[PDB]
Paper text:
Human CoVs [name] and OC43 (subgenus Embecovirus, genus Betacoronavirus) are related but distinct. A second type of envelope protein unique to embecoviruses, called the haemagglutinin-esterase (HE), serves as a receptor-destroying enzyme. However, OC43 and [name], subject to convergent evolution, lost HE lectin function. In [name], HE lectin function was also lost, but here the LD underwent several deletions.
Here we present the structure of [name] HE at a global resolution of 3.4 Å. The quality of the map permitted modelling of residues 15–346. Each protomer is stabilised by six disulfide bonds, the presence of which are corroborated by the cryo-EM density. Dimerisation of [name] HE is achieved by interaction of the vestigial LDs and the membrane-proximal domains (MP). The lectin domain jelly roll core is essentially conserved in [name], with RMSD values of 0.95 Å and 0.89 Å for BCoV and MCoV-NJ, respectively. However, whereas in BCoV and MCoVs extensive loops emanate from this jelly roll core to form the LD carbohydrate-binding site (CBS), such loops are either much shorter or absent in the [name] HE structure. Thus, [name] has lost all essential components of the HE CBS and the LD domain has been stripped back essentially to the jelly roll core. Compared to related embecoviruses, the LD of [name] has four unique N-linked glycosylation sites: N110, N145, N168 and N193, two of which localise to the remnants of the elongated β5-β6 loop and β7-β10 loop. Interestingly, the disordered portion of these glycans forms a crown of glycan density, which encircles the LD and covers much of its surface.
Author numbering:
A (entry chain B), B (entry chain A): 15 to 346
């Protein structure tokens, strides 16, 4: 037996959050209409256990108008996304700003996402309804991405928004640069969630996990910055960690380390290719090492460890540290 | 092999947070000066790996003048405390109040404590220094317990307190009944921590985990409620869960379920006696089942699971679910 650098599952209940490298609906918008762009084995399209869009991550769909309603449910959860918001995209809001605080926003968003998806099993995006108020206010623009989450409104009063139906949410709380402090005060219970931005040049965010109540917003600022899209975590289950595959570009383009900083123990197992990224369909689709990683979905396993995935459960060479499931031993 | 209902350790680096049932200095204040009151095996006094006081829990030492500076360091952490703040003590602040919100405060405190001690290894109590301001204000009293954490002061301005030296703190943020909102705004970074109390009759608390910065307090209230004691978590290590033994009274006295509600997976393993509590030294010291539980400290083991502790690592009967360490298998 040997630990394997794959992502897998223990039973028939798993789910994958994919992208254009795992999109079975991406063939309807290509020129060469084959299956040579998928990083997964192409017999996995008929499951319904894969949510994937033509060039959408969960962060990009969460903040921006380039939207795909991800929806999934499963015990073991595997992610393959994050290639659609990188230092390659150079996203800012005003030319004196920067994108490193956007990479910190990506780290905080995926940290909150793995930390909540290790405990819940259902995931979808929900909207935040309001009245017909002052609709938007264009404070950020970059000609390649335009965000709607969060809304910017001239303050003048305390707005309200309710949350029901779900079990645990994930809204943003974003500010540019101030001495002020926006709050998401709960009317029913009384729990207060706040954030300020002192020294971060561009639009800094944190990602709180709200409960299904009714919330008001108060900031004492010229612009309250209030969300319009939020996640939805349902059907709280027993603790199952969330697996990652390192979704990055080719080395001629930019990359980051955000999916490894956000993926920490015990709630998360990070799988990375050892070699570089050499595509098959084009430069940026179909690497053989990532086919070797994603090929573990095709079969049940016994154990899931921090160092690898174990197929059989008789014995093994190295000890499974931070193991999960029916796991073999290394004693003679 | 068989899973055991004990608490144990994997190497020479462990620590126990005890009480008067595990206090080797409690013999200097007794009448019958023997070792028949310890729930542990009495050859463990010379380690320095046990912190324990004559009738102090960590919650009681954290809020009240009945104080013991707990100090410990270790990889595997075992608790045996919580018998010193129960529904047997009937603690309130004003006769129209209640102690069930104090049991909710105990649940939230121990949840924050296990969640942080699963990742750090050093634990001690620190003080919060101030100027010579208005010293106290007696808002709560119960003739058996008098708390100093938090201080109550007529507001009149925004106070400041700094935190340095440590790596991660744990301060309270407590209020009685208001429509107002106290905050612990960070001057340096800008992170805001707040809480309000709408419908909870007695002094409700939440326990935030501050970073070592400099914090100001603003509430817009007649009384800001500001801490004077805080925990200190140092030397961040790799994830090791924190073990609990169910520290309760005898059944003729009151009990609770707080140490089982606060101890949830994956960060915590809860060990409980199956039978009742029949003491040996008196009614409330030295049960044979808790001697059987605490006797696992005397020897190294291989695995630590949610269902039991495994000594050898050849094979076992049932599968170790949520295991930890060098763990055996159950495949034939
Ligand atoms: C998953 O695993 C892969 C490995 O397969 C990791 O890829 C490595 O990523 C790091 C950074 O992300 C790379 O380090 C950088 O190397 C540059 C030079 O690389 C040349 O040499 C290598 C062989 O050594 C060639 O393969 C490669 O094609 C290049 O020809 C340096 O110039 C970089 O330094 C610059 O950036 C840093 C960033 O902080 C600055 O501090 C420096 O001052 C400088 O400006 C950098 O050191 C590494 O080369 C990659 N390896 C390979 C084999 O490609 C992934 O990072 C990993 N995934 C995660 C999430 O960690
Ligand atoms: C660790 O494991 C021990 C078991 O060894 C648990 O102890 C049990 O604790 C629960 C509650 O904490 C007890 O349930 C209560 O039982 C009362 C009657 O008990 C009699 O009968 C048992 C045998 O069945 C005798 O052993 C016992 O001495 C008594 O003679 C009920 O009257 C209680 O109901 C009342 O309180 C509840 C509280 O919500 C109300 O809702 C009810 O309406 C009612 O007012 C209650 O059901 C149980 O008896 C204990 N077992 C034993 C063997 O003593 C520990 O709780 C566990 N530790 C943790 C943290 O869970
Ligand atoms: C992203 O996708 C998710 C899931 O795909 C989605 O959440 C779902 O939204 C739908 C509607 O958008 C919800 O469906 C409603 O559920 C309630 C409660 O069960 C029903 O009463 C509703 O029925 C009424 O409306 C029907 C027509 O829609 C009528 O036929 C009927 O007679 C009723 O009048 C309705 O079915 C659903 O509850 C949620 N949640 C789940 C878990 O499915 C989410 O809204 C999407 N978000 C975005 C931004 O696209
Ligand atoms: C609970 O207990 C903990 C640990 O027992 C305790 O934390 C420690 O407090 C002491 C002092 O109370 C700290 O010791 C100081 O550390 C600094 C930095 O190393 C030294 O520079 C200091 O030395 C000065 O003072 C000495 C006399 O105390 C002089 O001899 C010397 O020349 C210097 O002038 C001093 O040793 C210590 O750093 C902390 N932390 C740790 C990890 O030990 C905590 O204060 C206690 N809390 C309560 C409420 O009792
Ligand atoms: C991994 O383990 C799971 C364990 O559930 C396997 O799922 C189960 O696979 C068997 C294969 O024979 C399914 O039985 C078949 O069911 C269909 C109807 O669903 C029936 O028409 C067939 O004749 C056969 O009886 C079983 O239903 C299925 N369990 C489910 C879906 O809950 C899974 O196949 C294993 N392998 C992989 C690669 O996932
Ligand atoms: C559980 O495992 C740990 C693994 O570290 C054991 O600790 C080690 O025990 C040996 C026992 O021989 C110690 O060796 C002795 O060291 C002393 C000096 O410390 C020396 O005087 C003796 O002659 C002997 O060589 C070893 O130091 C110790 N490791 C430490 C302290 O880091 C432990 O004994 C095992 N058992 C239990 C019940 O904990
Ligand atoms: C290890 O577990 C496998 C599970 O089937 C046992 O069966 C062996 O499986 C391998 C690969 O699937 C085959 O190459 C062997 O021929 C199988 N052996 C037999 C006897 O059928 C295997 O016996 C187990 N090894 C042990 C318990 O030592
Ligand atoms: C299981 O592990 C033990 C670890 O020592 C092996 O040794 C046995 O230990 C038990 C209890 O300590 C003794 O009763 C046996 O006599 C020991 N056996 C031998 C051969 O010394 C034991 O061999 C292992 N069992 C396996 C691998 O099946
Ligand atoms: C912002 O960018 C503009 C672009 O020319 C520059 O003139 C200006 O100095 C920068 N800084 C501020 C504070 O406006
Ligand atoms: C705006 O929404 C609030 C939500 O509580 C509601 O009370 C109010 O009537 C709405 N106003 C309009 C004009 O729809
Ligand atoms: C915010 O505070 C800083 C320092 O206190 C000050 O320099 C700056 O002018 C303030 N900005 C506003 C809009 O008050
Ligand atoms: C509080 O307790 C006192 C004790 O007698 C009682 O008179 C009073 O009605 C109670 N309630 C309030 C709101 O003061
Ligand atoms: C009170 O403490 C603050 C801390 O910043 C300090 O600035 C101030 O001088 C102190 N006042 C007195 C009277 O000690
Ligand atoms: C707090 O709010 C409630 C309901 O809004 C009200 O009944 C109560 O009088 C308020 N208390 C104070 C001190 O304003």
């Amino acid at each position: 037996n040997e630990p394997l650098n794959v992502v897998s599952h223990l039973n028939h209940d798993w789910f994958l959050f994919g992208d254009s490298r795992s999109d079975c609906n991406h063939i309807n918008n290509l020129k060469i209409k084959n299956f040579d762009y998928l990083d997964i084995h192409p017999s996995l399209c008929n499951n319904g256990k894969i949510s994937s869009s033509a060039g959408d991550s969960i962060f990009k769909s969460f903040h921006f108008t380039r939207f795909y309603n991800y929806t999934g449910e499963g015990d073991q959860i595997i992610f393959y996304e994050g290639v659609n918001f990188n230092p390659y995209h150079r996203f800012k809001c005003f030319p004196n700003g920067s994108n490193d605080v956007w990479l910190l926003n990506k780290v905080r968003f995926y940290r909150a996402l793995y930390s909540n998806m290790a405990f819940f099993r259902y995931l979808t995006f929900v909207d935040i309804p309001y009245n017909v108020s002052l609709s938007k206010f264009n404070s950020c623009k970059s000609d390649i991405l335009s965000l709607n989450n969060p809304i910017f409104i001239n303050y003048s009063k305390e707005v309200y928004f309710t949350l029901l139906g779900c079990s645990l949410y994930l809204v943003p709380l974003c500010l540019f640069k101030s001495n002020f402090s926006q709050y998401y005060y709960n009317i029913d219970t009384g729990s207060v969630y706040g954030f300020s931005n002192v020294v971060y040049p561009d639009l800094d965010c944190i990602y709180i996990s709200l409960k299904p109540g009714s919330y008001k917003v108060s900031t004492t600022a010229p612009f309250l910055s209030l969300p319009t899209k939020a996640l939805c975590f349902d059907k709280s289950k027993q603790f199952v960690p969330v697996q990652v595959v390192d979704s990055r570009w080719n080395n001629e383009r930019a990359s980051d380390i955000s999916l490894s900083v956000a993926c920490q123990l015990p709630y998360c197992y990070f799988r990375n290719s050892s070699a570089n990224y050499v595509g098959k369909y084009d430069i940026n689709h179909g690497d053989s090492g990532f086919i070797s990683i994603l090929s573990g979905l095709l079969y049940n396993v016994s154990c899931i460890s921090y160092y690898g995935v174990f197929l059989y459960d008789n014995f093994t060479s190295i000890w499974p540290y931070y193991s999960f499931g029916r796991c073999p031993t290394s004693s003679i």
